[PDB]
Design an enzyme around this catalytic site. Structure first.
Site, PDB file in Angstrom:
ATOM      1  N   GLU A  66       0.872  -1.146   0.000  1.00  0.00           N
ATOM      2  CA  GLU A  66       0.000   0.000   0.000  1.00  0.00           C
ATOM      3  C   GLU A  66       0.929   1.221   0.000  1.00  0.00           C
ATOM      4  O   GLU A  66       2.058   1.163   0.507  1.00  0.00           O
ATOM      5  CB  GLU A  66      -0.811  -0.123   1.284  1.00  0.00           C
ATOM      6  CG  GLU A  66      -1.790   0.972   1.594  1.00  0.00           C
ATOM      7  CD  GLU A  66      -1.312   1.812   2.756  1.00  0.00           C
ATOM      8  OE1 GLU A  66      -0.676   1.272   3.698  1.00  0.00           O
ATOM      9  OE2 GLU A  66      -1.584   3.030   2.715  1.00  0.00           O
ATOM     10  N   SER A 100       7.542  -5.742  10.946  1.00  0.00           N
ATOM     11  CA  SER A 100       6.718  -6.117  12.099  1.00  0.00           C
ATOM     12  C   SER A 100       6.352  -7.607  11.981  1.00  0.00           C
ATOM     13  O   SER A 100       6.332  -8.162  10.874  1.00  0.00           O
ATOM     14  CB  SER A 100       5.427  -5.288  12.149  1.00  0.00           C
ATOM     15  OG  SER A 100       4.585  -5.487  11.022  1.00  0.00           O
ATOM     16  N   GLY A 104       0.190  -7.706   7.859  1.00  0.00           N
ATOM     17  CA  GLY A 104       0.083  -8.645   6.750  1.00  0.00           C
ATOM     18  C   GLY A 104       1.274  -8.559   5.823  1.00  0.00           C
ATOM     19  O   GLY A 104       1.694  -9.567   5.259  1.00  0.00           O
ATOM     20  N   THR A 105       1.820  -7.351   5.651  1.00  0.00           N
ATOM     21  CA  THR A 105       3.002  -7.164   4.815  1.00  0.00           C
ATOM     22  C   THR A 105       4.298  -7.481   5.601  1.00  0.00           C
ATOM     23  O   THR A 105       5.171  -8.203   5.102  1.00  0.00           O
ATOM     24  CB  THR A 105       3.036  -5.756   4.219  1.00  0.00           C
ATOM     25  OG1 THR A 105       1.799  -5.508   3.537  1.00  0.00           O
ATOM     26  CG2 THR A 105       4.270  -5.523   3.310  1.00  0.00           C
ATOM     27  N   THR A 151      -2.560  -3.193  16.155  1.00  0.00           N
ATOM     28  CA  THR A 151      -3.508  -2.782  15.129  1.00  0.00           C
ATOM     29  C   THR A 151      -4.506  -3.915  14.793  1.00  0.00           C
ATOM     30  O   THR A 151      -5.580  -3.634  14.263  1.00  0.00           O
ATOM     31  CB  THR A 151      -2.764  -2.199  13.868  1.00  0.00           C
ATOM     32  OG1 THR A 151      -2.049  -3.215  13.142  1.00  0.00           O
ATOM     33  CG2 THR A 151      -1.815  -1.045  14.212  1.00  0.00           C
ATOM     34  N   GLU A 155      30.347 -11.798  11.713  1.00  0.00           N
ATOM     35  CA  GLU A 155      30.776 -11.705  13.100  1.00  0.00           C
ATOM     36  C   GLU A 155      29.602 -11.718  14.074  1.00  0.00           C
ATOM     37  O   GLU A 155      29.790 -12.131  15.210  1.00  0.00           O
ATOM     38  CB  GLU A 155      31.619 -10.448  13.328  1.00  0.00           C
ATOM     39  CG  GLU A 155      32.654 -10.647  14.416  1.00  0.00           C
ATOM     40  CD  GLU A 155      33.455  -9.425  14.820  1.00  0.00           C
ATOM     41  OE1 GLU A 155      33.867  -8.648  13.923  1.00  0.00           O
ATOM     42  OE2 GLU A 155      33.635  -9.222  16.046  1.00  0.00           O
TER      43      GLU A 155
HETATM   44  N1  LIG Z   1       7.482   0.312  16.649  1.00  0.00           N
HETATM   45  C1  LIG Z   1       6.609   0.432  15.642  1.00  0.00           C
HETATM   46  N2  LIG Z   1       5.646  -0.480  15.482  1.00  0.00           N
HETATM   47  C2  LIG Z   1       4.845  -0.217  14.426  1.00  0.00           C
HETATM   48  C3  LIG Z   1       4.901   0.854  13.565  1.00  0.00           C
HETATM   49  N3  LIG Z   1       3.871   0.788  12.641  1.00  0.00           N
HETATM   50  C4  LIG Z   1       3.238  -0.317  12.944  1.00  0.00           C
HETATM   51  N4  LIG Z   1       3.782  -0.981  14.006  1.00  0.00           N
HETATM   52  C5  LIG Z   1       3.340  -2.265  14.557  1.00  0.00           C
HETATM   53  O1  LIG Z   1       3.241  -3.204  13.499  1.00  0.00           O
HETATM   54  C6  LIG Z   1       2.061  -4.027  13.677  1.00  0.00           C
HETATM   55  C7  LIG Z   1       1.120  -3.841  12.513  1.00  0.00           C
HETATM   56  O2  LIG Z   1       1.865  -4.126  11.319  1.00  0.00           O
HETATM   57  P1  LIG Z   1       2.124  -3.022  10.130  1.00  0.00           P
HETATM   58  O3  LIG Z   1       3.666  -2.990   9.874  1.00  0.00           O
HETATM   59  O4  LIG Z   1       1.560  -1.672  10.403  1.00  0.00           O
HETATM   60  O5  LIG Z   1       1.400  -3.553   8.811  1.00  0.00           O
HETATM   61  P2  LIG Z   1       1.933  -3.778   7.330  1.00  0.00           P
HETATM   62  O6  LIG Z   1       3.298  -4.486   7.449  1.00  0.00           O
HETATM   63  O7  LIG Z   1       1.982  -2.472   6.623  1.00  0.00           O
HETATM   64  O8  LIG Z   1       0.846  -4.708   6.638  1.00  0.00           O
HETATM   65  P3  LIG Z   1      -0.567  -4.326   6.010  1.00  0.00           P
HETATM   66  O9  LIG Z   1      -0.909  -2.859   6.242  1.00  0.00           O
HETATM   67  O10 LIG Z   1      -1.497  -5.331   6.704  1.00  0.00           O
HETATM   68  O11 LIG Z   1      -0.439  -4.680   4.555  1.00  0.00           O
HETATM   69  C8  LIG Z   1       1.495  -3.640  15.040  1.00  0.00           C
HETATM   70  O12 LIG Z   1       2.053  -4.460  16.064  1.00  0.00           O
HETATM   71  C9  LIG Z   1       1.952  -2.190  15.183  1.00  0.00           C
HETATM   72  O13 LIG Z   1       1.974  -1.715  16.527  1.00  0.00           O
HETATM   73  C10 LIG Z   1       5.958   1.819  13.746  1.00  0.00           C
HETATM   74  O14 LIG Z   1       6.171   2.829  13.089  1.00  0.00           O
HETATM   75  N5  LIG Z   1       6.767   1.512  14.817  1.00  0.00           N
HETATM   76 MG   LIG Z   2       0.231  -1.185   5.867  1.00  0.00          MG
END
Ligand SMILES: Nc1nc2c(ncn2[C@@H]2O[C@H](COP(=O)(O)OP(=O)(O)OP(=O)(O)O)[C@@H](O)[C@H]2O)c(=O)[nH]1
Ligand SMILES: [Mg+2]
Ligand SMILES: Nc1nc2c(ncn2[C@@H]2O[C@H](COP(=O)(O)OP(=O)(O)OP(=O)(O)O)[C@@H](O)[C@H]2O)c(=O)[nH]1
Ligand SMILES: Nc1nc2c(ncn2[C@@H]2O[C@H](COP(=O)(O)OP(=O)(O)OP(=O)(O)O)[C@@H](O)[C@H]2O)c(=O)[nH]1
Ligand SMILES: Nc1nc2c(ncn2[C@@H]2O[C@H](COP(=O)(O)OP(=O)(O)OP(=O)(O)O)[C@@H](O)[C@H]2O)c(=O)[nH]1
Ligand SMILES: [Mg+2]
Ligand SMILES: [Mg+2]
Ligand SMILES: [Mg+2]
EC number: 3.6.5.-
Lengths: 428, 432, 127, 427, 432
Positions: free
Chosen positions: E65, E134, E138-139, E173, E248
């Site tokens: 996205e 993360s 999903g991504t 989320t 390392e």
């Molecule tokens: N520390 C931190 N956690 C994040 C951030 N954005 C999202 N998360 C965490 O990541 C998880 C949600 O995954 P995302 O990375 O937002 O989703 P995505 O990988 O974009 O996947 P989709 O939107 O489903 O396609 C949750 O546990 C969030 O709290 C960020 O900027 N920092």
């Molecule tokens: Mg996303």
């Protein structure tokens, strides 16, 4: 996941749909002519989820207005934001549905269904990234219920990969139009169980009760009922039209809210409860999540268990306070959440309050208590079906008695399924 | 669009049609010549010529020319084209057998031909409105024949009746109970809904509410016209809440044979008095459950309601209606069947009930017409059935029907069918 | 105090070493595999979508079957109404004619008798 | 149902027929020359039921005048309104019928019957919508009884779908001493039972009694009897001649009055009872419905039960008062109406009173008490038939004794039938 | 030259990359336009140079996205990156692993590998990859596991080091995050060489406690994450002496292939708004290393045994003071190491001082330390995740969402069985 195509069908569907368009237009700073005159960037950030940008600065709702009778279309066109709609998007027949689901689904509705598909196809093909469809309709009449459910299955055929969402108005003897309402509603529930991804249950029984008992309106009118529906729809869509992390799109909301395919019927909640002619702290708002008085479906949340809940807070309030109060509401009421779905309550806070309020709360609940609403419809249905009362108006349209037994069975199965998970324990 | 074709049969059907079409013209601003100087819903009942004149979607039929000749020479002789005012030479002599067979068969094709020509001008025909008496030879026999032929030519197209139930005070024939039972039997299967109007009820309302010593058909038909206009106002206007031919049928008829709603109307005020003040929405709503305001003599306390449709007109607000119906829902004296969760269809039109200038009825701000399916209406069938039995047991007057080609078996079949209908009202009123 | 320091590396912006407090107590996939797994998943996703469309096609066929049933029932009602009425109109025609033929037969016989009375009067007269 | 063709046969038929034509002409404002000089529109509204409109504004009675002897026809032509009749419509023989039914029905009458049919056919074919035929005749003579009944069967053969109505003058020993009247009457009743739809029984016994007892005429003449008949006929045809809802035509009247085919013999009633040189209230008029003194058939209405009654009120009176009094008269006298024919009394009010009166009442009754009139004829008949007295008057004309036994049986059956329904209960 | 390519996957991976690359620019004197007015040349391991004298990150930012990457494309650093290295699709994985792995990911995977290949082409001595993602999204879950698989095919023996965001309810989320976490860990276990886990709750609580931030945002969390990532990568981007190459990291911290999850600890985390405090000594910051309050993942090292410990000091730090600090800690604490590993630490001092984003929440400190320790105590984070998985999976709650994307139920059983084996491995390794 950007654009949503909105469809409103029948008298009820068009009335609550017009009210939805007028509340969200005011919130987004859009006037009756489609012109933006707001003072915040948050108002236009996700304007494209519901509005198309037309020739020169104007915004036009991505809405298709449907009815088998013209009167309803005229009243919307004449109404407050009537001119905001695309004129080519008003699709109507002349015959009417005679408050008969069979006429809306099989006879007159089938004749007008293609004219509707052509208009929704034009709107959908224009989308850079179509989320899906949002339908407002009643389950008690002929057009919204019969034709609205026919449209869902025809759209399902052409867009099987898109989200199908409904705002379905459940009939009540308290504010009833026709004697056959339980038949029309049962035949529609059967269709919604199989073909929608998310259905918000908007119960006229609960809305009448809120107006009468809480708002102290001795004689509520549809305007009083629809003021609650407009505030509720503004609240449930908050996530879709303002910037935010949680449930920002139709599919993400469905994935967070629906653990089992058939159990996609939501019980919406709203605080504060206001009348059309005119306070509230964070702890006060969070409490209303378990208050049957604040529910838009005539069910008691304390009667069942929540499978999943989305809580939306709006206005100028502390996010820290909202977080503290939401933890306390889940911990204190542990017995009303299913233990086998961890952290199943997701909270979101938006700085823009709904039209007319300074602070608000909206709850999207997937509770096993919604079986009370379906049981009520089932009992009203069997009372008529046992005697085969009014059945010739459906069999005369080519229907078999078998479709009634099937619609009833499916609905009783859905009640039986909510009960099964209400009783389901973590220790299998 | 959404057109309705009116068929007026026999003296009663034609004379009631006179009152209705005069009143519709007054209500829509149509002059007697068809001219009218925007709602536009009146187009369901009036077609328009190239010259801008408005013509009723109606056929007036009688086997004798006397009654229709009054229309042909009257104030509204230019409103109808002469091809839609159809008459033979000899009447049915208060004999169903003459209306249905001997005399009716000679004009039936011509009537159907003219109805076909009116149907040709319809883009969305809802159905037919047939006005007739139960007692007359033409009202009973010709209507039965016409109902049968309309089912062949138009299949299941909605067919609704306005039927004049016989009353001794104004009765013209001794054999009226025979004509009523024979026509009901033949018509049962071809009618979708029949609004019965008891002449004794209209007669007594005229005496009591309007202070008319000896009411004439002129007085009865002016009041009947008011009721018919109320039933068709939702079709001829677009108000706050409307109800079409299909919506009447779906809400009022739970079973095919149980298609006889009871009509109630309020307020009926004398054009005299003046000190009547204005009746509230609650007041006119309450009056609909009073037996004194009914169009058929029967006791609804002795029965159960299965459906109630409220047709309001004039200065009426939905908030005022809901409050009035709420108080009615709590009435112990108003009982509904247990298999009916909800029995209220409300319709509101902004046009007050217009009255014929010089008439007996006063100009009221608001009025209401209730259509209710009550099992109490079986009392009207029981009265009629008993009179039939008394005469039929002796074969009194039966030779008049047999002489026209009818068989005695038809009397037995017709009476057995009405006996089954009486049992049906009894079964339907039972709890589950 | 027992801590063995061992130098490892020392560079321009760093220095590294090991500190020992105590010694120890005890002395591939392929593209084809990937492609096979992803294609199998795509076929299951497409199969369930295809079965959905087959069932929606079965509901479209049912819609046509109810509309055809409604039309056949209206036509059968017309057929029954037409022959019931034709039977009734023809039985009635037979009966009315039979009643009027019997009454003209009675009158005819009475007129034959009148000429027979005239015959007897004539032989009584004269002779 | 518009035009009625009128036929008057024999001395009696022509005498009461001429009187009918002069009363209704006066009521309709028509003078002896056929000219209208009335004032009311109601007088001409249904003028076509009995009159043809001829060259210029003249009205001519649709009447055929019949007789086997010329005398009564000369008397009619000379009489008041004699010139109003169409001259070609006077059909007469020269022989006469010698007060013998057999001569009228089979011999002399059969020779003149075709000349009559020629004239009635011309009248009947001229009709836009023929109701039927109206015959005035006596039952005790030869021409009215024999030829009149022959005409009924011939006219019936050509017009089987039309109404056949008679005004039949029943003989009485009080008025006429011609000994075989019971034979002529019985042979005619037999014909009327089988071939008429409605027969008004005009009894000379009752007419003589009204003149003698009520009108105090020591020696009544046919002029005195016929003054009552003219008032009665004006009253019974009120519905046919003036605009109205009830019994407006011959078939509608028959359907309302005749529950059984053979029981079509009416007992006419009239109030006030007046002399040739003479106003009652509404309650006074309604009471006369059960008064044997006001009946034109020598029967007592209280002796039987009314199967059906048509009550006709004429003159300036309150319809509300008439309605109240008519309800009271059937509620108070419930035992004299058959319970198994609901609402069997139909009332009509006409603003035009009969000639010479300001208010009147006429009652068409189908009462089981009419069996008294038939019993009287039957007893007189059997008294002669038992001895075969005067039989050679009928057998000489070619008749068989069998026709007598058959006529007698048919009449006794008719009496037995009135008795059967008089005793019939709703049970 | 020892080049490293950074791959930022999904919202978390991209937003953490924003914080990392902003801090690396500050640390190396690179302006947002890529210019640097030029210490040592080691920064070239993370930045390539264009003909125009501009420095470009060796990085690819991927999301299914476009919203998150669009902020990078229009932000302050839009000139630092070339648009070909910022890759986005149109539709996201809707918090569904199966959607990111089998459905949407499948169509953009080749494009991402193509751009990775073009960055690898500019490398003389490619060490490997640093993947930021993360577990919950999903991504972050589905696309990363698909990408790890293809990277193993295209880059056989090239090192893959992860920085993975462990889900926390405070900022979560999606409800299905434990499913995505177990599914991505299963598919990625065999393809990763070392994964530094970061629990959102641990950093959320450090922000609240140490920085006095009431409701920490991703802006606050990522600024802190960025400090930790900078501490870890410092010896690759500057001429350091410990963990100077990616290989390392496996040598010093990973004794067994599956047990590749080090626990990260960082000190001091001081509020910028703090009233001018006295600087923390080497002893003080070292002691804080052994406090659970300063950990990146919530778990108890007292309940586990160490198999490796790496101390990464930064700033004004002298080896004499480090040795004295470590001596006291062994004296007072237990520091239980597994029986087959010696009790001891590998110490590294990077003279480059700790840098903070001006205007940020962190104070500029004279000295700081980052400990990387492979402890069996981290299995507590897997146990928490595994339990939540079991609760939902026992009822097949939300499973239809994955199966609908082409996944089989057997994959849930396989993934969970694999993480049950991992839990048993931590137990076996800690035995004696
Ligand atoms: N520390 C931190 N956690 C994040 C951030 N954005 C999202 N998360 C965490 O990541 C998880 C949600 O995954 P995302 O990375 O937002 O989703 P995505 O990988 O974009 O996947 P989709 O939107 O489903 O396609 C949750 O546990 C969030 O709290 C960020 O900027 N920092
Ligand atoms: Mg996303
Ligand atoms: N809340 C609410 N309920 C409404 C409204 N209008 C109708 N309803 C309810 O909806 C049901 C009737 O459905 P409708 O949508 O009005 O019927 P319809 O589709 O227009 O059918 P036709 O008249 O045949 O065209 C009843 O249970 C009503 O109580 C409205 O404006 N608001
Ligand atoms: N309310 C009302 N009833 C009428 C009217 N005219 C007749 N009736 C009633 O209708 C019945 C008689 O039937 P009609 O309609 O007059 O007769 P018809 O249909 O013309 O048939 P025929 O004249 O026998 O061919 C009686 O019950 C009358 O009271 C009228 O104008 N209004
Ligand atoms: N009321 C009344 N009865 C009459 C009159 N003239 C004769 N009668 C009766 O009629 C019967 C005799 O029949 P007539 O009519 O005179 O005889 P006819 O029919 O002309 O037959 P012929 O004299 O044989 O040519 C008896 O019952 C008389 O009492 C009359 O003017 N008025
Ligand atoms: Mg509507
Ligand atoms: Mg008529
Ligand atoms: Mg003579």
């Amino acid at each position: 996941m950007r654009e949503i195509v909105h469809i409103q069908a029948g008298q009820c569907g068009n009335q609550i749909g017009a009210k939805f368009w007028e509340i969200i237009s005011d919130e987004h700073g859009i006037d009756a002519t489609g012109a933006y005159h707001g003072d915040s960037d948050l108002q236009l950030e996700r304007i494209n989820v519901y509005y198309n940008e037309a020739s020169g600065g104007k915004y036009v709702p991505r809405a298709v207005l449907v009815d088998l009778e013209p009167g309803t279309m005229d009243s919307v066109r004449s109404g407050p934001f009537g001119q905001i709609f695309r004129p080519d998007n008003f699709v109507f027949g002349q015959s009417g549905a005679g408050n008969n689901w069979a006429k809306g689904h099989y006879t007159e509705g089938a004749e007008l269904v293609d004219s509707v598909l052509d208009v929704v196809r034009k709107e959908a093909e224009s989308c850079d990234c179509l989320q899906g469809f949002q339908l407002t309709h009643s389950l008690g009449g002929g057009t919204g219920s019969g034709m609205g459910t026919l449209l869902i299955s025809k759209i399902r055929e052409e867009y099987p990969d898109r989200i199908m969402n409904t705002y379905s108005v459940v009939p009540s003897p308290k504010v009833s139009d026709t004697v056959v309402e339980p038949y029309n509603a049962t035949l529609s529930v059967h269709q919604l169980v199989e073909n929608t991804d998310e259905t918000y249950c908007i119960d006229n029984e609960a809305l009448y009760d809120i107006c009468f008992r809480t708002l102290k309106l001795t004689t509520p009118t549809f305007g009083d009922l629809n003021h609650l529906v407009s505030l509720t729809m503004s609240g449930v869509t908050t996530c879709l039209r303002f910037p935010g992390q949680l449930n920002a799109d139709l599919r993400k909301l469905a994935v967070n809210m629906v653990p089992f395919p058939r159990l996609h019927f939501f019980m919406p909640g709203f605080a504060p409860l206001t009348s059309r002619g005119s306070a509230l702290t964070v702890p006060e708002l969070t409490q209303q999540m378990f208050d049957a008085k604040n529910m838009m479906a005539a069910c008691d949340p304390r009667h069942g268990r929540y499978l999943t809940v989305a809580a939306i807070f709006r206005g100028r309030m502390s996010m820290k306070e909202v977080d503290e109060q939401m933890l306390n509401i889940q911990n204190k009421n542990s017995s009303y959440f299913v233990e086998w779905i961890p952290n199943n309550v997701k909270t979101a806070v938006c700085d823009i309050p709904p039209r007319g309020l300074k602070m608000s709360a909206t709850f999207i609940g997937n509770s096993t208590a919604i079986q009370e609403l379906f049981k009520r419809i089932s009992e009203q249905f069997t009372a008529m079906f046992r005697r085969k009362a009014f059945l010739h108006w459906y069999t005369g349209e080519g229907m078999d008695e078998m479709e009634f037994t099937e619609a009833e069975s499916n609905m009783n199965d859905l009640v039986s399924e909510y009960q099964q998970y209400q009783e389901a324990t973590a220790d299998e | 669009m959404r057109e309705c074709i009116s068929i007026h049969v026999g003296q009663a059907g034609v004379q009631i049609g006179n009152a209705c079409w005069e009143l519709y013209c007054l209500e829509h601003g149509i002059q007697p010549d068809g001219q009218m100087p925007g709602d536009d819903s009146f187009n369901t009942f009036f077609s328009e010529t190239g010259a801008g004149k408005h013509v009723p979607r109606a056929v007036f039929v009688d086997l004798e020319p006397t009654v229709v000749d009054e229309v042909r020479t009257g104030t509204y002789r230019q409103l109808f084209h002469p091809e839609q005012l159809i008459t033979g030479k000899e009447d049915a002599a208060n004999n169903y057998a003459r209306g249905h067979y001997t005399i009716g068969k000679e004009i039936v094709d011509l009537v159907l031909d003219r109805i076909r020509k009116l149907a040709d001008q319809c883009t969305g025909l809802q159905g037919f409105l047939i006005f007739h008496s139960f007692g007359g030879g033409t009202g009973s026999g010709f209507t039965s024949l016409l109902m049968e032929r309309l089912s062949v030519d138009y299949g299941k197209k909605s067919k609704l009746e306005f039927a004049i139930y016989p009353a001794p005070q104004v009765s013209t024939a001794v054999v009226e109970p025979y004509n009523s039972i024979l026509t009901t039997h033949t018509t049962l299967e071809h009618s979708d809904c029949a609004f019965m109007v008891d002449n004794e009820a209209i007669y007594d309302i005229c005496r009591r509410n309007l202070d008319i010593e000896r009411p004439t058909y002129t007085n009865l038909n002016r009041l009947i016209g008011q009721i018919v206009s109320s039933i068709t106002a939702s079709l001829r206007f677009d108000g706050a809440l409307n109800v079409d031919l299909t919506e009447f049928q779906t809400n009022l008829v739970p079973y095919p044979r149980i298609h006889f709603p009871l009509v109630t109307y309020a307020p009926v005020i004398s054009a005299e008095k003046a000190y009547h003040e204005q009746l509230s929405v609650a007041e006119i709503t309450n009056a609909c459950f009073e037996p004194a305001n009914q169009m058929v003599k029967c006791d609804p306390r002795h029965g159960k309601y299965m459906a109630c449709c409220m047709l309001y007109r004039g200065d009426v607000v939905p908030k005022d209606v809901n409050a009035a119906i709420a108080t009615i829902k709590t009435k112990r004296t108003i009982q509904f069947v247990d298999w009916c969760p909800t029995g209220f269809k409300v319709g509101i039109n902004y046009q007050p009930p217009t009255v014929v200038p010089g008439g007996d009825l006063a100009k009221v701000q608001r009025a209401v017409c209730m259509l209710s399916n009550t099992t109490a209406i079986a009392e009207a069938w029981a009265r009629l059935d008993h009179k039939f039995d008394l005469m039929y047991a002796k074969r009194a007057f039966v030779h008049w029907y047999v002489g026209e080609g009818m068989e005695e078996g038809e009397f037995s079949e017709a009476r057995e069918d009405l006996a089954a209908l009486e049992k049906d009202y009894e079964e339907v009123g039972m709890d589950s | 105090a027992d801590m063995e320091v061992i130098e490892l590396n020392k560079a321009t912006s760093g220095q590294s070493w090991e500190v020992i407090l105590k010694p120890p107590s005890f002395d591939d996939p392929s593209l084809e595999e990937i492609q096979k797994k992803l294609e199998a998943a795509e076929e299951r996703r497409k199969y369930q979508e295809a079965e959905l469309l087959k069932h929606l096609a079965e509901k479209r066929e049912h819609e046509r079957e109810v509309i055809q049933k409604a039309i056949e029932e209206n036509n059968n009602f017309i057929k029954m109404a037409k022959e019931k009425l034709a039977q009734k109109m023809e039985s009635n025609k037979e009966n009315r004619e039979a009643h009027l033929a019997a009454m003209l037969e009675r009158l005819q016989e009475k007129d034959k008798h009148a000429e027979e009375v005239r015959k007897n009067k004539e032989l009584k007269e004269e002779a």
